[PDB]
Scaffold this motif. Structure first.
Motif, mmCIF file in Angstrom:
data_model
loop_
_atom_site.group_PDB
_atom_site.id
_atom_site.type_symbol
_atom_site.label_atom_id
_atom_site.label_comp_id
_atom_site.label_asym_id
_atom_site.label_seq_id
_atom_site.Cartn_x
_atom_site.Cartn_y
_atom_site.Cartn_z
ATOM 1 N N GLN A 13 0.820 -1.211 0.000
ATOM 2 C CA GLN A 13 0.000 0.000 0.000
ATOM 3 C C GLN A 13 0.863 1.274 0.000
ATOM 4 O O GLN A 13 0.303 2.260 -0.534
ATOM 5 C CB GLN A 13 -1.005 0.019 1.171
ATOM 6 C CG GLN A 13 -2.215 -0.831 0.753
ATOM 7 C CD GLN A 13 -3.501 -0.425 1.432
ATOM 8 O OE1 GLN A 13 -3.492 -0.129 2.615
ATOM 9 N NE2 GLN A 13 -4.560 -0.416 0.661
ATOM 10 N N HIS A 16 4.166 0.096 -2.952
ATOM 11 C CA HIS A 16 3.593 -0.325 -4.240
ATOM 12 C C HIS A 16 4.379 -1.416 -4.982
ATOM 13 O O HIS A 16 4.493 -1.489 -6.202
ATOM 14 C CB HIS A 16 3.363 0.870 -5.204
ATOM 15 C CG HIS A 16 2.536 1.918 -4.484
ATOM 16 N ND1 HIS A 16 2.994 3.209 -4.342
ATOM 17 C CD2 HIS A 16 1.375 1.839 -3.795
ATOM 18 C CE1 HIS A 16 2.112 3.897 -3.626
ATOM 19 N NE2 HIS A 16 1.128 3.084 -3.265
ATOM 20 N N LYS A 17 4.942 -2.299 -4.172
ATOM 21 C CA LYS A 17 5.737 -3.445 -4.604
ATOM 22 C C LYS A 17 5.839 -4.461 -3.453
ATOM 23 O O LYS A 17 5.618 -4.139 -2.278
ATOM 24 C CB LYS A 17 7.174 -3.070 -5.073
ATOM 25 N N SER A 90 -4.426 -3.453 -8.837
ATOM 26 C CA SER A 90 -3.536 -2.347 -9.257
ATOM 27 C C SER A 90 -3.922 -1.067 -8.513
ATOM 28 O O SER A 90 -3.015 -0.200 -8.502
ATOM 29 C CB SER A 90 -3.504 -2.186 -10.760
ATOM 30 O OG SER A 90 -4.765 -2.588 -11.269
ATOM 31 N N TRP A 92 -4.663 -1.033 -5.278
ATOM 32 C CA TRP A 92 -4.363 -1.363 -3.905
ATOM 33 C C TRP A 92 -5.424 -1.858 -2.932
ATOM 34 O O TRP A 92 -5.284 -1.639 -1.703
ATOM 35 C CB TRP A 92 -3.477 -0.210 -3.258
ATOM 36 C CG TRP A 92 -2.378 0.123 -4.247
ATOM 37 C CD1 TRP A 92 -2.326 1.261 -5.014
ATOM 38 C CD2 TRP A 92 -1.263 -0.697 -4.637
ATOM 39 N NE1 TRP A 92 -1.228 1.195 -5.855
ATOM 40 C CE2 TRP A 92 -0.564 0.013 -5.636
ATOM 41 C CE3 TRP A 92 -0.790 -1.961 -4.237
ATOM 42 C CZ2 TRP A 92 0.587 -0.489 -6.249
ATOM 43 C CZ3 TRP A 92 0.349 -2.473 -4.849
ATOM 44 C CH2 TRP A 92 1.033 -1.731 -5.843
#
Length: 108
Positions: A13, A16-17, A90, A92
């Motif tokens: 979150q 982003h990975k 995508s 989250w």
């Protein structure tokens, strides 16, 4: 490492990975992982399966134009894979499954 529902949920979150201890199924295979022998911990010490696209064929997870789902293995240490997965979109949304993608529950 980070391989709990909350630690990986919160890490995604945010960064982003997935954290560094995750590898896709095809990368694991290349290193010598054979699903039938449950040897992931022997060929890829401290790694877990994660980052592959999840089809959502059965439409069990919420769809949206341009939305794609990925999965990550949760709570794995060694041996054969378990039945716990973190499903992330995508945009989250984070869902969890503990029964081999039969049912899903929102976590983020």
């Amino acid at each position: 490492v980070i391989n709990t529902f909350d630690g990986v949920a919160d890490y995604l979150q945010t960064y982003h990975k997935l954290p560094d201890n995750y590898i896709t199924k095809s990368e694991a295979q290349a290193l010598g992982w054979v699903a039938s022998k449950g040897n992931l911990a022997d060929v890829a010490p401290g790694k877990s399966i994660g980052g592959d696209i999840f089809s959502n064929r059965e439409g069990k997870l919420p769809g949206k134009s341009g939305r794609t789902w990925r999965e990550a293995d949760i709570n794995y240490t060694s041996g054969f894979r378990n039945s716990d997965r973190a499903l992330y979109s995508s945009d989250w949304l984070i869902y969890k499954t503990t029964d081999h993608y039969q049912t899903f529950t929102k976590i983020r």
